[PDB]
């Protein structure tokens, strides 16, 4: 079974597709990070001719791109700025698929060039108090999958209840994606980017570098020759540590 991202826009149909096991369980689809408690480049503007020639606005040499900052609407290249991927939701062509043992996952629907933006990891941003509260709730409920992503010291992203299809990217000890933290509007966001050419049909993975606070570690089924056997690796850390101190 597989589904495209558009399938998640229709809740009623998503829900009944889920009853027949045709789509993953329902969660709240959001366009950007939601906080539980709240807290310009020097590119030379492309001519119309360069635009027509296929020149890239704010490409490799953009001072903002280089520091992993997105441009605003006030960018010198304006509409044509190619450095506003997070804000324009310019995700890769990706599908959500049911895997053998890891639950649902992500898969390339087209070839994906190296260093291609895939999706933003959206969710509810928690502080330490909120994180601890949800650690308990998720344990009480006996959740299997976990969706905590460290953003900064007092900010963890939690896509358990709210997020987008990025919450489906499985771990691999030998992955074809990575996280990159991007500054968007003075706020930090995390997004997945490919680390290499990913052929169409290939599953999309990143290395969790998982900080396990659980008593028992989950077994990893990535199937790599360098697989570490478990998510979190050898060590178990405290709750506060996983949570960023």
């Amino acid at each position: 079974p597989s589904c495209v991202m558009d399938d998640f826009r229709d809740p009623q149909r998503w829900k009944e597709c889920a009853k027949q096991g045709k789509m993953p369980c329902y969660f709240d689809l959001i366009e950007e990070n939601v906080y539980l408690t709240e807290r310009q480049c020097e590119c030379t503007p492309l001519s119309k001719d360069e635009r027509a020639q296929g020149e890239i606005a704010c490409g490799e040499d953009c001072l903002n791109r280089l520091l992993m900052i997105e441009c605003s609407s006030r960018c010198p290249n304006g509409d044509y700025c190619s450095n506003r991927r997070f804000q324009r939701k310019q995700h890769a062509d990706v599908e959500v698929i049911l895997t053998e043992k890891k639950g649902w996952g992500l898969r390339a629907a087209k070839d994906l060039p190296s260093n291609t933006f895939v999706l933003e990891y959206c969710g509810e941003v928690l502080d330490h108090k909120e994180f601890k509260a949800r650690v308990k709730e998720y344990a009480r409920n006996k959740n299997i999958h976990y969706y905590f992503m460290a953003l900064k010291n007092d900010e963890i992203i939690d896509a358990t209840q709210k997020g987008n299809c990025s919450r489906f990217m499985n771990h691999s000890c030998e992955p074809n994606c990575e996280t990159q933290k991007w500054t968007v509007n003075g706020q930090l966001r995390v997004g997945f980017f490919t680390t290499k050419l990913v052929p169409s049909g290939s599953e999309l993975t990143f290395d969790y570098q998982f900080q396990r606070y659980g008593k028992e570690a989950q077994k990893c089924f990535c199937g790599s020759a360098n697989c570490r056997g478990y998510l979190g690796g050898e060590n178990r850390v405290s709750i506060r540590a996983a949570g960023g101190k």
Binding site: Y138, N143, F148, M149, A150, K181, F210
Partner: peptide, 15 residues
Amino acid sequence: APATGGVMKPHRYRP
């Protein structure tokens, strides 16, 4: 207490 659980940690890929 928690039987399972953990936090994913962003890092740049390095071979």
